Amino acid sequence: GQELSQHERYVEQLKQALKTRGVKVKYADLLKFFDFVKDTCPWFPQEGTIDIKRWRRVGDCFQDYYNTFGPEKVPVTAFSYWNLIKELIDKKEVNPQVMAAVAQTEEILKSNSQTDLEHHHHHH
Numbered sequence: 489g490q491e492l493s494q495h496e497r498y499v500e501q502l503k504q505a506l507k508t509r510g511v512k513v514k515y516a517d518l519l520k521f522f523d524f525v526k527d528t529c530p531w532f533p534q535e536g537t538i539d540i541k542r543w544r545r546v547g548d549c550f551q552d553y554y555n556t557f558g559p560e561k562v563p564v565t566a567f568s569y570w571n572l573i574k575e576l577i578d579k580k581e582v583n584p585q586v587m588a589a590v591a592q593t594e595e596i597l598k599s600n601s602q603t604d605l606e607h608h609h610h611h612h
Contacts, residue, residue, distance in 0.1 A: 494583045495536065502572070509568045524550070537589035538577050543570070 499522070503513040525531060530546040532539055547570070554562075580586075596604045 491536070491583060491585065494585065502576075506568060506572060509572065511565055511568055532589065535585050535588040535591065537582075537585045538573060539592075540574065540577065543573065
């Protein structure tokens with residue numbers, strides 16, 4: 489939704505918080521970096537949050553196909569992204585996306601309809 493503003497910040501921020509690691513931020517970077525994730529939007533196409541598990545999926549999927557092209561350049565800077573993002577989530581001040589993201593884990597017995605044990609139960 490309107491939260492889209494988050495991306496605008498993430499792009500400028502993440503890139504900034506990156507330069508600190510010794511990285512560079514060029515316009516050509518937005519075209520590729522933006523088009524890269526946008527491809528499969530691994531950041532959760534629903535909430536658009538950060539995901540470590542999914543991140544690996546896109547990482548191996550891109551690295552695998554990219555490798556087939558026997559690339560010599562193989563930019564290592566990508567290593568910094570994983571390291572930064574890895575700890576980036578640790579932040580609790582993450583946009584509300586936290587509540588919409590938590591969707592990752594849900595009570596298997598939230599309702600009676602659930603096959604598992606009902607939400608309400610009694611025991612001696």
